[PDB]
């Protein structure tokens, strides 16, 4: 499940981060992923 919002769904299980796409899009800027292009 997504280690942020109790969600079985949306999971980005890649690289061992396991945040669903909705929360990972928000935490993207704090993780290191920024908008270039």
């Amino acid at each position: 499940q997504c280690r942020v919002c109790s969600s079985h769904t949306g999971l980005i299980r890649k690289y061992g981060l396991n945040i669903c796409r909705q929360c990972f899009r928000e935490k993207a800027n704090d993780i290191g992923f920024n908008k270039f292009r």
Binding site: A28, G32, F33, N34, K35, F36, R37
Partner: protein, 103 residues
């Protein structure tokens, strides 16, 4: 007598080049033998992301990006110079690595 190789990795080129020029000029101003800051290709890590969040409208696509730059400098110095330089050069954003072996 230690022959050491240093490798930096960073996303912000200003801090990385600050640390690089610092180590360069600080290594030559007290007389050391070195190979200048060699520059590995900036790898651009991209992530494909669908435009559609809610299932309304057709499917079109987008892209996110990150630029990762890596440098390396080779040196020959004792134990104390390496310890002190490693402690003094520590910066945020820039990740430094000090390897001793030459195999």
């Amino acid at each position: 007598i230690i022959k050491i190789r240093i490798t930096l990795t960073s996303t912000k080129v200003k801090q990385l080049e600050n640390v690089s020029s610092n180590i360069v000029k600080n290594a030559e101003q007290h007389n050391l033998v070195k190979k200048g800051p060699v520059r590995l290709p900036t790898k651009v890590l991209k992530i494909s992301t669908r435009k559609t969040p809610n299932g309304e409208g057709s499917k079109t696509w987008e892209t996110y990006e990150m630029r990762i730059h890596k440098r390396y400098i080779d040196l020959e110095a004792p134990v104390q110079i390496v310890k002190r330089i490693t402690q003094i050069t520590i910066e945020p954003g820039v990740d430094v690595e000090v390897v001793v072996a030459s195999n």
